[PDB]
């Protein structure tokens, strides 16, 4: 069934699909610690709005030139587009966790991101700062160590997935370096 999700992602147009309980068990047999993995993905997407805005503002917080006149987050329209880019990256990381394979992140998101930003003039060194913030954000939620929110989960250890998401974030920086 995971191929069907891949067929949804790759089809080059808006498309939807879902998992039923019968087919869900096929996924549960296929995945290693699927109980943890699905809870982990929920922990990101359930707070993705909080994560992205803080990281982009955190980038602005340490680098105030980005909001100075002519800056790439100056005037509303550039500011929204940066938030948009943060979301898309974070979403593509989330599916990479769900599939447990980094291919979709590279082939659909990271490919051409280097060439794209330079032609747009996006400062890539600061883009790394925002992504590296989300990696700090994402690890805390999966380990349920966030300061201002604690989640409800069945007891147990989620260390491996926390390391797994870490590699996916680090792929982003290397592509745009």
């Amino acid at each position: 069934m995971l191929d069907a999700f891949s067929r949804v992602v790759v089809n080059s147009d808006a498309k939807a699909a879902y998992v039923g309980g019968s087919d869900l068990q096929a996924l549960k047999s296929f995945i290693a610690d699927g109980n943890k993995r699905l809870d982990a993905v929920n922990s990101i997407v359930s707070n993705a709005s909080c994560m992205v805005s803080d990281a982009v503002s955190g980038m602005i917080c340490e680098n105030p030139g980005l909001i100075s006149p002519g800056g790439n987050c100056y005037t509303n329209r550039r500011m929204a587009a940066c938030l948009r880019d943060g979301e898309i990256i974070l979403r593509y990381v989330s599916y990479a966790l769900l599939a447990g394979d980094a291919s979709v992140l590279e082939d659909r998101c990271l490919n051409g991101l280097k060439e794209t930003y330079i032609a747009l003039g996006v400062p890539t060194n600061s883009s790394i700062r925002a992504v590296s913030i989300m990696k700090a954000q994402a690890v805390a939620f999966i380990t349920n160590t966030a300061t201002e929110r604690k989640m409800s989960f069945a007891a147990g250890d989620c260390t491996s997935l926390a390391s797994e998401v870490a590699s996916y974030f680090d792929r982003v920086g290397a592509a745009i370096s």
Binding site: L38, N42, R91, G112
Partner: protein
Amino acid sequence: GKFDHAPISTYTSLCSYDKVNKAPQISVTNVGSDEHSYVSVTSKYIAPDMAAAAQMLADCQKYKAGGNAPTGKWMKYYPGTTVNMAPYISLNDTGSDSSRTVSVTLDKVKISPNK
């Protein structure tokens, strides 16, 4: 208030003409008395309101004249409509093991003006 509905043949797959556009109409009423509160359900015909739809176009003109997006020869990396598309995922933990569901859907990403 006359409206020119589409030909019957264009929706033969969906439903018969004497039942199309009828959808549930639900009213739920709270009162402190468990002996007097009630629920009501019916199917009603939902007609098109030209007056509201005229207003809708007048409000949406603002977006029509704010450009769309930049473009360049780098567009080859976004071959379909996938420019600014990302996968959306939904997860459903619930009180029944068979009712659990998951979703994944490729879709456009935009930030509402309140954020």
